[PDB]
Amino acid sequence: KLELRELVLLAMVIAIKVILGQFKVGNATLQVGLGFIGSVMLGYLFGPWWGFAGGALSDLVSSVIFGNLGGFFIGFTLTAALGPMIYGFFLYKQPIQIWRVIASVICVTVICNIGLNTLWVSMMYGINFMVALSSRILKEMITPWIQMVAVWFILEGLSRVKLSRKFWS
Amino acid sequence: AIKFENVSYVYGLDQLNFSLEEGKFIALVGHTGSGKSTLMQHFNALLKPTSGKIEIAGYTITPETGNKGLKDLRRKVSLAFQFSEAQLFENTVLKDVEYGPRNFGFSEDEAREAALKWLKKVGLKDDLIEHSPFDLSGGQMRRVALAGVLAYEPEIICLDEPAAGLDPMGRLEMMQLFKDYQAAGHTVILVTHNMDDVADYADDVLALEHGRLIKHASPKEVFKDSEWLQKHHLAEPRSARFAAKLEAAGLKLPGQPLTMPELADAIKQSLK
Amino acid sequence: GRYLPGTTFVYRVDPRAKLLTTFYFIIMIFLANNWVSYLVISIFGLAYVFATGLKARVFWDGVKPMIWMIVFTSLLQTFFMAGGKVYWHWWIFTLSSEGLINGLYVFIRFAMIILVSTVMTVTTKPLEIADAMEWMLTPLKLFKVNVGMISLVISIALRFVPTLFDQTVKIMNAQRSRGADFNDGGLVKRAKSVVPMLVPLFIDSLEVALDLSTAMESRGYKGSEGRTRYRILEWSKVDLIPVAYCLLLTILMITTRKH
Amino acid sequence: GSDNIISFDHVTFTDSPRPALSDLSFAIERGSWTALIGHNGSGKSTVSKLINGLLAPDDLDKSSITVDGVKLGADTVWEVREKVGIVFQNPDNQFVGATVSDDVAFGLENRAVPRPEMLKIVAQAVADVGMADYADSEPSNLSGGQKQRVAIAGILAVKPQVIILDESTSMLDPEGKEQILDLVRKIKEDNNLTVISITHDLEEAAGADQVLVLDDGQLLDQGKPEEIFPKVEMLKRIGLDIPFVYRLKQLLKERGIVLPDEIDDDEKLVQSLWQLNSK
């Protein structure tokens, strides 16, 4: 269903997600990873299913180039693929709204960050689930709101390109 | 005068010593991998040196200088990168051109005036303003990008192949734009591989090789030594190549020709 | 970690063999319950590390970004799990002996997971890891999915990561040169600074996608099926080491676990 | 011996009121470097993509494109891409493979060439250009000229009959452009294949075997370079400068030294100056 031009664009967006995942913006008090920009790009432009594919392949590509810091595990790929799935479910082919940004960021944070990842961390490293959750609850309480504010301005930037000449389809 | 004092950059530059007085069209030549872009980024403190002093536009850049006080420098020294149209992001042309003045201290009414004046100067049509920059063509996008970096009237404009990928007519238009910008009293630094522009427009020719300055002279004295030019790694202007062919054909030419009009005039003088 | 070149026999091992070895090592580190099981997994992991022959510098580079998390998790599992003898008794902290050994177990699970995955990312070139991952995605064909499409997307993304990173650096330099303070000015102004970094990048991605798709369709890319493969991965005699090593690990984990 | 003959063509760009090409008509002689110069808005950008079917003319009944007797259409678009190979403008984008020997082998993979013959052909085509030492070098470790050489090798390896240098040397330094042109000329002599040059670089059209000039989607004039270039007045109203030799001839004419108009090469002009020097 997806044309070759759209497949190459998906590859470019995956490369963007990997590059931004290696980025960390802010001062020393807080370092929010810029992977959410790639997740929003994959979900908003390609949909939930190609978003899932792009998220899994971006996890594989990040493992290939920059190395999998946490050990090669399938669950991390599943989480990094379910991120763009929810982003696409809430944001694909829909008008830009603050409501959808709010819901998509909150649902991805609940399910992927303090959800599945806490399950995979507790399974791999053997700690009790509440211990891993308390380990990972701090940054994922103040980080999602910064993601919220940044995502509101990403979609404004991406829309002005899609409604422009450069984006054909 | 832009002055570099034993400037070096590691992780490449090595002991560069020169002084470009303000108001001249300095041209920067050399093959890729000779640290030309490193010098270009050093000009406005994008890459601070590891050891040395840069006295550019009245501000001193030492290795230990911080990021505070650089925004005051970047208003005077502006860098235009290769394929500058890749940086266009705003919703319209006018906002994209005035994005520079807005964060270089211009008010909303001042930035609009400067952006409109420079959009007129670069040759963009008046109906093209207030349209999305992506709607335009490659030449028009290059014009918008160039207007975005000349908008606040920088003292030292340091360019990087501003007409790469453009036709000779558009290339000539842009080159005459920058040469007219020079006549206003602003220094222009041109980082190009096309020596046919260097022999025509430049008044002072830098020459890098492997990260070390090897020649700093007027283009007449740079291209007079073909033995040195081939000894190092540089190319000759086409007009100079033709003159060298004429000498090897037994037809002697007076003086040193480097541009097409002076080459033609020398040919006319030699025959008569 | 990046590919540090070498000559030790681990570099001769096919990337499909040792990617499966890394996955299987994670699977059998899931099976570590008793102390003797942890001893078996630790000696096997350290034997793998020594047989790789890398210096400790690269491994200690790899451990460092997570060492705060390692010590935090070990000390948290130390306090939450309590049993046996007691030291340092307080309402919040109790340095019980079972706490210390459980913290040691979690530390070992951090060590044998990071050291093994550091061996893969250092001793296999990224293109070979891509070939290995395509081989691991070969079984997906029984879900009637188009695995050739996935392999093509991975290959193009890997080829175009360095060029897009250079483009990102160039774009950030171009926007900084006209006054983009990318890290000063508060949250909502910091968020507005990702548009000048992303929209030019998206424009470049659109241009590169159109140009590359046009070039591929010009050179004769009719589909993902019917093409031969130029860069093949071939087995070797030295691949008997992982299949024996991973098999010899299964015996001890099954026999040794507390169940 | 026409190879490509676009006859009464029309392209509208799916969006724009004025069509890009309007009743274009020409023929490319077999074994001749045919340069096709025009302005950016003249529509020459789509000639290359129209030739091998990536764009279709609006009226397939009125507009007929023939490539080696294979009338281009929805069915025969793949046989036409086994004869016509195009080298596009930007070297970075068209470089698909993760190494040099993989970008060259990407054309041969798509035709299901067996791997041993694939290796032989890839080695021969990579050594044909001056890239024998970079058979494992990555895309980002190569220059602008080197990536264009690899693109030319990849187009070559599939044994094409037309090589369309579609603005190939647009982004290269003048030393790289000369190297690419020497390489392409040597390849064209060795393999006996047609080369079509869609460029705005007039020096490359100065050495062609036939020059086609386009204004606003139509064929303005054609013929040898010795005829299109001297009429500088025609090239002035369409926005095109003339090559160095002809520009110097016009400058000398303005000075007062008139020269005959068949002088096209550099050596001819210097010798003609020498004959005037003796006087």
CA B202 to each of CA B24, B121, B195, B222: distance values in angstroms, whole numbers, following the listed order:
8, 22, 10, 11
Domain containing D35 equals: 1-279
Closest Cα in chain A, distance from residue C238 (Å): 23
Domain containing B96 equals: 1-272
Closest Cα in chain C, distance from residue D276 (Å): 52
B78 contacts in C (CB within 8 Å)? 177-178
In chain D, % helix, strand, coil (3-state, to 5) comes to 45, 20, 35
Q: How many domains does chain D have?
A: 1
CA dihedral defined by C96, C99, C103, C104, rounded to 10 degrees? 70
**Which positions ≥6 away from B119 have C-beta within 8 Å?**
B93, B94, B97, B129, B144, B147
Nearest to C158 among A64, A69, A168 (CB): A64
Given a contact cutoff of 8 angstroms between Cβ atoms, the answer to whether B177 and B80 are in contact is no
C201 contacts in A (CB within 8 Å)? 16
Alpha-carbon distance D72 to C57, whole Å?
Answer: 61
Alpha-carbon distance C220 to C201, whole Å?
Answer: 28
List gaps in chain B by the residue before each (C–N > 2.5 Å): 11
Alpha-carbon distance A64 to D57, whole Å?
Answer: 44
Please indicate whether, in this complex, the C-beta atoms of C171 and B84 are within 8 angstroms of each other: no
Give the residue from chain D lying closest to B170, CA to CA.
D239
Angle at CA of residue B193, ends B189 and B199, nearest 5°: 70
Q: Which residue has the tokens 């008044």?
A: B203
What would the two tokens of residue A54 be?
Answer: 């792009």
Extract the annotated binding site of B for ATP: 30-37
Query: Which residues in chain A (74-103) have CB-CB distances under 8 A to chain C?
Result: none
Closest Cα in chain A, distance from residue C193 (Å): 9
Alpha-carbon distance D136 to D95, whole Å?
Answer: 14
Write the DSSP assignment of chain A as a string of letters.
Answer: ---HHHHHHHHHHHHHHHHHHH-EES-TT--EETHHHHHHHHHHHHTTHHHHHHHHHHHHHHHHHH--TT-S-HHHHHHHHHHHHHHHHHHTTS---HHHHHHHHHHHIIIIIIIIHHHHHHHHH---HHHHHHHSTTHHHHHHHHHHHHHHHHHHHHHHHHTSSS---
Nearest to C154 among A37, A61, A167 (CB): A61
Please indicate whether, in this complex, the C-beta atoms of B132 and A157 are within 8 angstroms of each other: no
What is the tally of helices (H) and strands (E) in chain D? 12, 11
Alpha-carbon distance B215 to B192, whole Å?
Answer: 16
Cα dihedral across residues D56, D58, D60, D64: positive or negative: negative
C117 reaches A (C-beta below 8 A): yes
Task: Report the structure determination method.
Answer: cryo-EM
Closest Cα in chain D, distance from residue B190 (Å): 15
What would the two tokens of residue C63 be?
Answer: 């451990």
Query: Which residues in chain C (103-162) have CB-CB distances under 8 A to chain B?
Result: none
3-state class (DSSP) for residue C124: coil
A160 contacts in B (CB within 8 Å)? 91, 132
How many CB atoms sit inside 10 A of residue B187's CB?
A: 24
Closest Cα in chain C, distance from residue D93 (Å): 5
Which residues of chain B have a Cβ shorter than 8 Å from any chain D Cβ? 32, 137-139, 164-165, 167-169, 172, 193-196, 235, 238-239, 242, 245-246, 249-251, 260-261, 263-265, 267-268, 270-271
The Cβ-side half-sphere exposure at C31, using a 13 Å CA radius, reads 18
Q: Pick left, alpha or beta for residue D48 (phi over 0 → left; psi -120 to 50 → alpha; otherwise beta).
A: alpha
Nearest to A61 among C109, C121, C158 (CB): C158
Which chains are within 8 Å of B by 3+ CB pairs? A, C, D
Alpha-carbon distance D57 to C194, whole Å?
Answer: 41
Give the residue from chain C lying closest to D119, CA to CA.
C230
Q: Which residue has the tokens 């000039």?
A: D213
For chain A, which residues make up each domain, given as ranges? Answer: 1-169
Please indicate whether, in this complex, the C-beta atoms of C118 and A37 are within 8 angstroms of each other: no
C72 reaches A (C-beta below 8 A): yes
